[PDB]
Design a protein around this ligand. Structure first.
Ligand SMILES: *[C@@H]1O[C@H](CO)[C@@H](O[C@@H]2O[C@H](CO)[C@@H](O)[C@H](O)[C@H]2NC(C)=O)[C@H](O)[C@H]1NC(C)=O
Lengths: 211, 403, 215
């Protein structure tokens, strides 16, 4: 098979030069195309023919392909450039498409944000249905990396946990949710339920009790 | 009466008794044939259509390139080839490109390079063929059969109308007797090949405007072409005249299209004979059809009619045609119809010798009841004169001057 | 001026046939090639194939040649991408892209069509209120949308009135194949008693709109 190799993550401080490398074999003989894709938006053309910049793109995005390596140069990086970056090229024949693995950029200017956690016990109507659901809500944290655990009467909870991936807000601190499915019998078979939320060496604990 | 108001008219005067009248029919021109005790007949060549024309050739003047690539090999390392070279729809250029240790090749010398791109002609023109067997004339004739008003110049119906017929003529069988039941028959033995010319030309269509071009001019055009009529994505010959290669560097010979060529040919067609289609067939504009109609079985309608008695009225102001003749519309109020119109021209006015000759020879009134309208055309004498319509009391006189 | 309007979001089941379309308007459709790109959730871009509408010339990637069918009706200037047997692993966002002059040179991109394929069934949600205890100054009132399928579900507060603190977290795809979400809002404790809070849950594929009261 044939794939283009990209570094998974690349970090850069604001105002510095971020460099992204795309490794290929037929790149000494074929061109490359650099694309940028933001969450939810469709990809935009950053570089075409390995050295040219389209209209509407800022002057800082430059590029150059040298031998078996293509290189995207971002002089004076800013926080709005934090997105996914792909390269694209053709095979040795030149009539098929080839996409790289991707390079998720990271800008460290923004300050650390402790998570805001809200714990909700099961509703009154769900207990009459002989079911239960605990709702642990996370918002306004950064970066997007949390560890959710549940503690029934202090002891750990192995099954029943459901957790989402860290999703981004317009803050741009991240947000996520975690639900715990249970029955009314197990909800009333303990005394205290806690939602531990780990974020950057900072655990947040919230507790609910059937009282 | 379909020729009243024609710019290029021809007052062809026939022979008293004789059935031989030679008439030449130019496009946009008509001929009024007046003769002895026979009705005067308007003759016009309206259309010179052509039959199925076969698509001989088809050139290109707007192309679209697609799917290009350039394979390059190192010096002394083989002949560079691509994956879609032998495809006919692809134009390719195989040139040499300087290489070295900077480009990747381990030798300093000239190397190979091949660039290919898919051809697709967006806007193309077609050139067809014409044969004398294909052309077909069309002649319309309308007698001055004492027709009501002016708006008797409409082809609506006509099939139920005498004194006005259409005939079709082909070089193979150009006999085409014209029937006009009230006035009889009217033979017309016409001869083609007077139309100059059809020897070796082409019917060229580009977008929607057509012309007639020569043989070697249309053969000598630096544009892509194919001789088939296929619509199934055929192979275009001479694809190099629209696709240019310039300034290859190491892996991409910059390909450039030479743009559209419509106006480029339009500058080469200033002076060519224009043309016009007819949906499927094509029209011509040269004409000049020499013809000889025999008027043997022509019969004048309205000789038994007795000279009208009641009073006429001027329905519209008489006007002078560009040739000198005068058209008059009169309106009879009386059941005495049918009857011959007592129209004449005189200078003494009392009484009552005529000077000028009529054009609409022996004018009648078709309808009987009750108040009919009819048309007239006279050739007044040079100088001042009077025109008199009617008989006896209640007659109408009018002053007139020619030139 | 160039416009590549793709199809709408599609939810199918494993095995069903499907055909997504890319309607174009604004350029010479029979001149430039049309390429398709697949992007799985949380994964990267994958070029599937390309097609020239002048003669429907097709180039398929070896990873997809024999599993998809690319057609195009040049009469209406629209490309297509169809599957006969839809697998569960085909759920992704699909982009149609007008190519450039060079081979496989991507020029114009669409907005992407969402293809969801699961063996679940359309089912309405179950709405449950969420109120905290009793601080005593501010509070957070939430609503719980339980065991629904498929996306999306729009939840507002008092008919779109409350605009501050409206929080709608994304859904979680549980192992049962159904989605579930919750929507919270920040309300001061002093406002309770002088203001009635009701969440408006609305799900179109089930045609079910349930508004719930919150303590
Ligand atoms: C030319 O057109 C005129 C209409 O402008 C025709 O007039 C006819 O008039 C009579 C009496 O009003 C109607 O009974 C007919 O039905 C009309 N026919 C048409 C065509 O509508 C006239 O016949 C046409 N041909 C001529 C004047 O010879």
């Amino acid at each position: 098979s044939y794939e283009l190799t990209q570094p998974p993550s690349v970090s850069v401080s604001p105002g510095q030069t971020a460099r992204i490398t795309c490794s290929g074999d037929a790149l000494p003989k074929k061109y490359a195309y650099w694309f940028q894709q933001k969450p939810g938006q469709s990809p935009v053309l950053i570089i075409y023919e390995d050295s040219k910049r389209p209209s509407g793109i800022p002057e800082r995005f430059s590029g150059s392909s040298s031998g078996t390596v293509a290189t995207l140069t971002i002089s004076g990086a800013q926080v709005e450039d934090e997105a996914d970056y792909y390269c694209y090229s053709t095979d040795s024949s030149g009539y098929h498409g080839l996409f790289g693995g991707g390079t998720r950029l990271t800008v460290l200017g923004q300050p650390k944000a402790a998570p805001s956690v809200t714990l909700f016990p099961p509703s009154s109507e769900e207990l009459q249905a002989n079911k239960a659901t605990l709702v642990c809500l996370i918002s306004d944290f950064y970066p997007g990396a949390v560890e959710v655990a549940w503690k029934a009467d202090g002891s750990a909870v192995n099954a029943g946990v459901e957790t989402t991936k860290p999703s981004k807000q317009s803050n741009n601190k991240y947000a996520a949710s975690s639900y715990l499915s249970l029955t009314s019998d197990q909800w009333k078979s303990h005394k205290s339920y806690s939602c531990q939320v780990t974020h950057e060496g900072s655990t947040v604990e919230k507790t609910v009790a059937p009282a | 009466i379909r020729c009243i108001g024609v710019s290029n008219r021809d007052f062809v005067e026939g022979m008293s008794g004789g059935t031989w009248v030679d008439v030449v029919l130019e496009h946009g021109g008509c001929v009024t044939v007046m003769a002895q005790d026979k009705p005067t007949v308007d003759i016009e060549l309206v259309t010179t259509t052509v039959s199925n024309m076969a698509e001989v050739r088809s050139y290109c003047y707007e192309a679209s390139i697609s799917d290009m690539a350039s394979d390059s090999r190192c010096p002394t390392q083989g002949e560079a080839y691509l994956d879609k070279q032998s495809d006919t729809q692809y134009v390719c250029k195989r040139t040499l490109v300087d290489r070295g240790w900077g480009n990747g090749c381990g030798l300093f010398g000239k190397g190979s390079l091949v660039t290919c791109a898919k051809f697709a002609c967006s806007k193309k023109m077609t050139g067809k063929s014409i044969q004398p067997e294909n052309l077909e004339y069309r002649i319309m004739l309308s007698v001055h059969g004492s027709q009501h008003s002016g708006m008797i110049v409409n082809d609506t119906g006509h099939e139920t109308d005498e004194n006005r017929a259409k005939v079709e003529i082909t070089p193979n069988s150009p006999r085409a007797e014209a029937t006009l039941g009230g006035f009889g028959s009217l033979g017309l033995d016409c001869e083609p090949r007077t139309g100059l010319d059809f020897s070796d030309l082409y019917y060229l269509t580009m977008n929607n405007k057509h012309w007639l071009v020569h043989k070697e001019w249309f053969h000598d055009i630096p544009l892509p072409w194919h001789a088939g009529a296929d619509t199934g994505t055929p192979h275009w010959n001479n694809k190099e005249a629209l696709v240019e290669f310039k300034d290859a560097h190491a892996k991409r010979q910059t390909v450039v299209v030479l743009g559209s060529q419509e106006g480029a040919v339009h500058t080469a067609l200033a002076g060519a004979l224009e043309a016009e289609m007819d949906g499927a067939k094509g029209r011509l504009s040269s004409g000049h059809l020499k013809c000889r109609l025999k008027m043997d079985k022509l019969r004048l309608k309205g000789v038994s009619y007795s000279l009208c008695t009641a009073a006429f009225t001027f329905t519209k102001i008489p006007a002078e045609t560009l040739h000198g003749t005068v058209t008059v519309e009169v309106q009879y109020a009386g059941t005495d119809g049918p009857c011959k119109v007592p129209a004449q021209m005189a200078v003494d006015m009392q009484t009552l010798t005529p000077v000028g000759r009529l054009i609409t020879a022996n004018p009648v009134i078709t309808e009987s009841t009750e108040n009919s309208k009819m048309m007239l055309e006279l050739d007044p004498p040079f100088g001042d004169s009077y025109i008199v319509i009617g008989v006896g009391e209640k007659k109408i006189t009018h002053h007139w001057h020619r030139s | 001026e160039v416009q590549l309007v793709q199809s709408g979001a599609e939810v199918k089941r494993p095995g069903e046939s499907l055909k997504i379309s890319c309607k174009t308007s604004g350029y010479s459709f029979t001149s430039y090639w049309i390429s398709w790109v697949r992007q799985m959730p949380g994964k990267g871009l994958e070029w599937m194939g390309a097609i020239d509408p002048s003669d429907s010339d097709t180039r398929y990637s070896p990873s997809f040649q024999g599993q998809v069918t690319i057609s195009a009706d040049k009469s209406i200037s629209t490309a297509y991408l169809q599957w006969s047997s839809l697998k569960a692993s085909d759920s992704a966002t699909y982009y149609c892209a007008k190519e450039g002059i060079a081979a496989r040179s991507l020029d114009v991109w669409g907005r992407g069509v969402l293809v969801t394929v699961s063996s679940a069934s359309t089912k309405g949600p179950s709405v449950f209120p969420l109120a905290p205890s009793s601080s005593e100054s501010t509070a957070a009132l939430g609503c719980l949308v339980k065991d629904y399928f498929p996306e999306p579900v729009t939840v507002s507060w008092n008919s779109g009135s409350l605009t501050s603190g409206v929080h709608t977290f994304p859904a979680v795809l549980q192992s049962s194949g159904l989605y579930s979400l919750s929507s919270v809002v920040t309300v001061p404790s002093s406002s309770l008693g002088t203001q009635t809070y009701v969440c408006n849950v609305n799900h179109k594929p089930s045609n079910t709109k349930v508004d719930k009261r919150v303590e």
